[PDB]
Amino acid sequence: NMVKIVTVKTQAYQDQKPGTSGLRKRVKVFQSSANYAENFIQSIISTVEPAQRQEATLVVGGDGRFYMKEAIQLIARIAAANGIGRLVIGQNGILSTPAVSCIIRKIKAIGGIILTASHNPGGPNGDFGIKFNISNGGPAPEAITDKIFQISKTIEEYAVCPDLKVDLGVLGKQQFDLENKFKPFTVEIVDSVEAYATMLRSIFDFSALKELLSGPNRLKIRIDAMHGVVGPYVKKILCEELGAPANSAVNCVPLEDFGGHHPGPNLTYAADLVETMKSGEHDFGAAFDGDGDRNMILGKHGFFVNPSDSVAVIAANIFSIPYFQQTGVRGFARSMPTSGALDRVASATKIALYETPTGWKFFGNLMDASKLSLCGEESFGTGSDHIREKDGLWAVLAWLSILATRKQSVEDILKDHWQKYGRNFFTRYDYEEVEAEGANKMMKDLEALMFDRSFVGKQFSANDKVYTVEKADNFEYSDPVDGSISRNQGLRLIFTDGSRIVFRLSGTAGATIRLYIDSYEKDVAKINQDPQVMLAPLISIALKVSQLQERTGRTAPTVIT
Ligand SMILES: [Ca+2]
């Protein structure tokens, strides 16, 4: 109840970058490395002028990783002794990343510390992360993350309350009286799900989702939370409030280790859900990543809706969703390597399509400027301007509202969408841990070759067709808001039939090659053929023009999705 504020002299580290997605180290780093977490928490609290701390609220929560509660305890001690007026924390420390974004904008907080390492595994031998979100509810941008890192290199003391202890399991206010401070420190413990449910309730028709999900004629759904943070949201919204039967909530109790495996969503990693969905007993499966920003969408028998098709089908039936009826469509966005299925829909409906470089800030900027309603990422990311993060459970409810409106299966919707818009066959090849100089040279040469003036027009034949290069560059994007220029974001081979090949090198232990292949077909004799077969021509073309085997020694990507 009554705590001393004490100051501790510290030794600064040199690698405490927040990055675009939070500071991530092994839990063992955050556990053994002395004051490692205490340092970085101080560094960021030092980003806000001391004059505004009493008036300031941070929301903090996390995805349930091992070491989370201890770290929220830690945020509290530094928050108090530095003059921050209020923390509002998820019950048990539980806050999905969409929920944090929601609460920040709802209570007009100055921002939030999210304890999440997203897909990376949690556990005593796992990873742990600390992300900072600012007052618009979205990720701390570069200028704030630079100041913070600059501070973490110099940090030689932090202010703390060594004996403060928050009870995260009980709801309501906790008031902490700092001895030799006048204004108290107040923590508000809130229900993990309520503010976020209250938001979803406002954008969807829960009445209609309740009709479709209940009764003897309900569609059967299985929602796999991968033992992460969305578990309680599924059970409390999907099962308790719109009345889905209890067994729909698969792996919906958060575990400190996420159940052994890592909370990353794909057809290999959520095979849990996939085996269930192969039954053909359920009409719709979904699976979420660890902090709830990503989603995979499944159909009857495990029909797979690839994320770039997903964002397109949502765009195609967007007014099924009350939120968009009232807002209208301010525009569509998708990362550059995402398939152009969404483009086909934005082109039919004459709505702006922004092709963004991978990363959130480009989506966020467009939302802040009221020109972006629905954004999509090939990497299981789907979001809307209801917040400033991507939102997994939200994508599921959009799909459910569309199923309700449309009264077809997931698969018949995709077939009609393809038949009506043509299909963007799509895959991405991951080459993990390739040798860097080879990787870098491969891009270097393929860039040089693309820049020669004879390259546009160069034809390539395959077992049937000829693709012709319409354009070929390293992707550069001029942000229409903050004015930034982002360059060297990916080699694009644009073919005249609407197909593309794009190469990228990842940034987050060696070098990893991503090769995205977007083969577009409009003929209903090609439309429902096997995707890896129709993608093979462009895959052969891609590998030959990059000489990727010759530069990496690989015959096969690590991972195909
Ligand atoms: Ca995530």
UniProtKB/Swiss-Prot annotation:
Positions of post-translational Phosphotyrosine modification: Y354
GO cellular component: cytoplasm; cytosol; extracellular exosome; extracellular region; ficolin-1-rich granule lumen; tertiary granule lumen
Annotated phenotype, changing E378K: In CDG1T; decreases strongly solubility
Cofactor(s), names only, from the UniProt record: Mg(2+)
Modified residues (Phosphoserine): S118, S135, S202, S207, S214, S370, S379, S478, S486, S506, S540
Enzymatic class: isomerase
Control of this protein's activity: Glucose-1,6-bisphosphate enhances phosphorylation of the active site Ser-118, and thereby increases enzyme activity.
EC number of this enzyme: 5.4.2.2
Keywords, in A-Z order: Acetylation, Carbohydrate metabolism, Congenital disorder of glycosylation, Cytoplasm, Disease variant, Glucose metabolism, Glycogen storage disease, Isomerase, Magnesium, Metal-binding, Phosphoprotein
Catalytic machinery residues: S118
Mutagenesis or variant effect for E389K: In CDG1T; decreases strongly solubility
The record's free-text note on cofactor binding: Binds 1 Mg(2+) ion per subunit.
Associated pathology: Congenital disorder of glycosylation 1T: A form of congenital disorder of glycosylation, a multisystem disorder caused by a defect in glycoprotein biosynthesis and characterized by under-glycosylated serum glycoproteins. Congenital disorders of glycosylation result in a wide variety of clinical features, such as defects in the nervous system development, psychomotor retardation, dysmorphic features, hypotonia, coagulation disorders, and immunodeficiency.
Subunit (UniProt): Monomer.
PANTHER family tied to this protein: PHOSPHOGLUCOMUTASE-1 (PTHR22573:SF37), PHOSPHOHEXOMUTASE FAMILY MEMBER (PTHR22573)
Family statement drawn from the similarity comment of this UniProt entry: Belongs to the phosphohexose mutase family.
Protein name from the UniProt record: Phosphoglucomutase-1
Organism, scientific name: Homo sapiens
Classification of source organism: Eukaryota, Metazoa, Chordata, Craniata, Vertebrata
